[PDB]
A paper describes a structure:
A second product of the reaction is glutamate, which is neurotoxic, allowing tumor expansion in the brain at the expense of normal brain cells. Our first identified potential target for GBM was branched-chain amino acid aminotransferase (BCAT) 2 T186R (UniProt, PDB: [name] T159R). There are several [name] structures determined, each with two molecules found in an asymmetric unit forming a biological assembly.
Here, we present the first [name] T186R variant structure with a novel trigonal crystal lattice, with only one molecule in the asymmetric unit. The biological assembly, the dimer, is formed over a 2-fold crystallographic symmetry axis. The T186R amino acid substitution is found close to the interface of the dimer. No structural difference is observed at position 186. The CB and CG2 (methyl) carbons of threonine 186 are almost perfectly overlapping with the same carbons in the arginine side chain in the [name] T186R structure. Less than 6 Å away from the T186R mutant, the side chain of K59 from the symmetry-related [name] monomer is found. One can speculate that repulsion of these amino acid side chains may destabilize the [name] T186R dimer. Destabilization of the [name] dimer may affect the enzymatic activity of the [name] variant depending on the pH of the environment, yielding altered enzyme kinetics. The crystallographic experiments confirm the hypothesis generated by in silico structural homology modeling as detailed in Lichti et al.. Synergistic data were obtained by FT-ICR MS/MS and X-Ray crystallographic studies, providing both confirmation of the sequences of the expressed proteins and demonstrating differences in crystallization patterns due to a single amino acid substitution.
Numbering used by the authors:
A (entry chain A), B (entry chain A): 0 to 24, 27 to 365
C-alpha cells in the first residue's frame, strides 16, 4: 500500500491517575517500568494519532499475527541523565533507521523516523523523573512494532501496533573499571545465516538463544560466542558485537570487527567504537572476518591484546576465557589493562553524561 | 524446574452467552473463529486448571516475552466431520509430540500430551456444530504456547499461556482432482539452517517468509521453493514438505523426500505419505537429499513423474513449474495423471471422513 505516517504534532496525552512508586537505591534489568507508554495503531486507514497513555496491558485478538508468526520487532536505546538533570539519548537516529529496516523486512508499515523520535522525546519528558542520575545508571527505551491482524494466514498484516515502554537500569561496573566474562564457543548452535534475518532486530532471533545460554551456564560460561561457517567465524557474543584488538598476521596492530555481510546485527555501539577509533587515527581499524584458527594462532603467539563485546547493555564488555572444543582458552584482555576498553568506556561516559558536548547526544 | 501438568479431569467450562452466527455456504482460511477457546496458565506454582471459555481477547503485559523475543510456538491439525456427523482428528498424537519438542526448544513448560489432547477433544465437542460437513471441508485446530513473563530479559519464562482456537475451513479442490502451483527457487532466501530451529513449528520461522512470498508473487509464482546449501538442496515448498516421484539415477522408480537432518519440519502428512507408500510396497520409498542438479538432469531425461508438497492445508499439492536462475522449468506432474497424488488424496479422504475405519483417526 501507499506510505503515510503519524505526526508528533498530533500527539494525545493522558496522564496517569495512579502513579507507581519509584524504586529505592535495585534496578534489575527489564523488570521495572515507568508510569506511561506510547501507543500508535495502524490499519487500512493508515496510522491513527499517537498517544501517551498510562502504562497498561495490551488487548490482543488470540489470532494476532504477532503471536503466531512472530510479526514483531524491537529496538533498544538508552537515555542518560547528567548531574545537571538534563536527559540525553545516545545516537537515537541510528536506532530509528534500524527499526524501519526491520519493519520493511517483515512487511510492517513504515513511518517517519523523526516523528517517532519526537514522540519518544515527549514520552521521556513526561517520565523524566524516572531517569536515574547515579553514576553508570540509565533509562532503557524499548520501542516495539507488531503485526496485529486477526488472521491465521501467513501474510502481510493489515493492522499493526507500535508502542514504547521505558525501564530504569542500574550500573554494570564501578566507575573506571570493568569485569570480564567467559564464553562458550560451540559450533553446533547457529544464531544466524547468510540469507536469513540475523542482521535485523526481530524477536524471532532471540527466543532460540534461551536454551543455548542455559547450555553455556551449564558448562561454566557466562555468555555464548556465536560461530559461523566451516571456518568457525566469530560473529557475536551474546547479544553484543565482537571486537578484537591484536597484532594481525601481517604484523600490524589493529582493531577488527566482523563485516556486515548478513549475519551481524549492525550495533549502534559498534558503529560508535569504529567511528571513535577511526577519528583517533592511532592504529588500523578494519571490518574483516575473524576465524577461530586465526585467534588460536594469535593467542599462542602473544598477539592478542583485548577481546570484547559491545552493545547498549554494558557498552564494552571484556572477555577473559573461551571454551572451544573442550579446551579452555585464556584470553589476556585484563593483563593488557584493558587499556583500549577503558579508553572507550571513558570517552563514552563523558559524551553520554554530558561532561562534554557532542553531536551524538540528542537532548530530551 | 520440576515438571507438572494440568489435567483434563480438572477442566472448567464456561459457555458463551453471545454466540456468533455461523458462516453461510465462504470459509476463508484462518479468519473465522468458533464460539469457545481453551486456555491454561502456567507460573512458578505450576499449571492452573484448564478452562473452556468464550472466545475472547488476550490481556498481555506490554513486556510479555511472547512479543519481544518470540517465545511462541504453535500447532495445526484438522478435524473432519463424516456424513454421519461424527467428528475425527487426524493423527493428533503426532502434533502433540511435535508441540512438546517445540516447547522444550524454547524453554517453555512441558505438559502431558494426552491431557492436552483430551482437553482439545472436549473443546471440539462443545463447538461440534462449527465443524462443516461439505465434501473437502474441515475444522482447523490451532494450539499455541507462549511465554508471558513481564520482563525484557532474554531468559527462560517464569509464566506462560497455552490456548487453542478453532476455524472452519473450506475445500481446496473439487472431489477427485487437483490443481497445480508454480514455485520460485531463489537461493538468496534461506528458510532454515543446520544448527537452527527450522525443524520446530516456532513462530519465528514464519514471519521472515512473508516478504519472500511477496517476491514470489511479483515474479509470477504462487509459492516459494526453499533451497539450502551450495548444492541447492530442495527442502520445503511454502509451508509444506516436498516429494518427488521419479526414476532415480540408478534406474529405480522411487518416491523421495528430504531427510530430517535439521532443516526440514517433520510434517504429519509427510510421515503419513511415507507410511502409506511403504505399506503398499510397490516402489522404493526413501529419505535422501534432492538437489537442483539432480532434478534438472531428471527433467531433461524424462525421469520425473510427479513433484508435490504435503501439509495439513491441502494435503497434497502438485507442482507444474519452477522458476530457477531465471529459467522457467516445466514440471510434468499433470501429464502423469497425477496418478500417485490422486491415489494419496483418495486414501486420505477415505480415512479422514470415516468411509473406512483406521487407527490414524481419533474420534471426538
Ligand atoms: C542489539 C544487538 C547488538 C548490539 O546493538 P547495539 O545497537 O549496540 O545495542 C548486537 N548483536 C545483537 C545480536 C543484538 O540484538
Ligand atoms: C506445518 C509445516 C509443514 C507441514 O506439516 P504438517 O504436519 O504435515 O501440516 C511442513 N513444513 C513447514 C515449514 C511447516 O510449518
Amino acid at each position: 500500500g501507499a506510505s503515510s505516517s503519524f505526526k508528533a504534532a498530533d500527539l494525545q496525552l493522558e496522564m496517569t491517575q495512579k502513579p507507581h512508586k519509584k524504586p529505592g537505591p535495585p534496578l534489575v534489568f527489564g523488570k521495572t517500568f515507568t508510569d506511561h507508554m506510547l501507543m500508535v495503531e495502524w490499519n487500512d486507514k493508515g496510522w491513527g494519532q499517537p498517544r501517551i497513555q498510562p502504562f497498561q496491558n495490551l488487548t490482543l485478538h488470540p489470532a494476532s499475527s504477532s503471536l503466531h508468526y512472530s510479526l514483531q520487532l524491537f529496538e533498544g536505546m538508552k537515555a542518560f541523565k547528567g548531574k545537571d538533570q538534563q536527559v540525553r539519548l545516545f545516537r537515537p537516529w541510528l536506532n530509528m533507521d534500524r527499526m524501519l529496516r526491520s519493519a520493511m523486512r517483515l512487511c510492517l508499515p513504515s513511518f517517519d523516523k523523526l516523528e517517532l523520535l519526537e514522540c519518544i522525546r515527549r514520552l521521556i519528558e513526561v517520565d523524566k523523573d524516572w531517569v536515574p542520575d547515579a553514576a553508570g545508571t540509565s533509562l532503557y527505551v524499548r520501542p516495539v512494532l507488531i503485526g496485529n491482524e486477526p488472521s491465521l494466514g501467513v501474510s502481510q498484516p493489515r493492522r499493526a501496533l507500535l508502542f514504547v515502554i521505558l525501564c530504569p537500569v542500574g550500573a554494570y561496573f564501578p566507575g573506571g573499571s570493568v569485569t570480564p566474562v567467559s564464553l562458550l564457543a560451540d559450533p553446533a548452535f547457529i544464531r544466524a545465516w547468510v540469507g536469513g534475518v540475523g542482521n535485523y532486530k526481530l524477536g524471532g532471533n532471540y527466543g532460540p538463544t534461551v536454551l543455548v545460554q542455559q547450555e553455556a551456564l551449564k558448562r561454566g560460561c557466562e555468555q555464548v560466542l556465536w560461530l559461523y561457517g566451516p571456518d568457525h567465524q566469530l560473529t557475536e557474543v551474546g547479544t553484543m558485537n565482537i571486537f578484537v584488538y591484536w597484532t594481525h598476521e601481517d604484523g600490524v596492530l589493529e582493531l577488527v570487527t566482523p563485516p556486515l555481510n548478513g549475519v551481524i546485527l549492525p550495533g549502534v555501539v559498534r558503529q560508535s567504537l569504529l567511528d571513535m577509533a577511526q577519528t583517533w587515527g592511532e592504529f588500523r581499524v578494519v571490518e574483516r572476518t575473524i576465524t577461530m584458527k586465526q585467534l588460536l594462532r594469535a593467542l599462542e603467539e602473544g598477539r592478542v591484546r583485548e577481546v570484547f563485546g559491545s552493545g547498549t547493555a554494558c557498552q564494552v564488555c571484556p572477555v577473559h576465557r573461551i571454551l572451544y572444543k573442550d579446551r579452555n582458552l585464556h584470553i589476556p584482555t585484563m593483563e593488557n589493562g584493558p587499556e583500549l576498553i577503558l579508553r572507550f568506556q571513558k570517552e563514552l561516559k563523558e559524551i553520554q553524561y554530558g561532561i562534554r558536548a557532542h553531536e551524538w547526544m540528542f537532548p530530551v
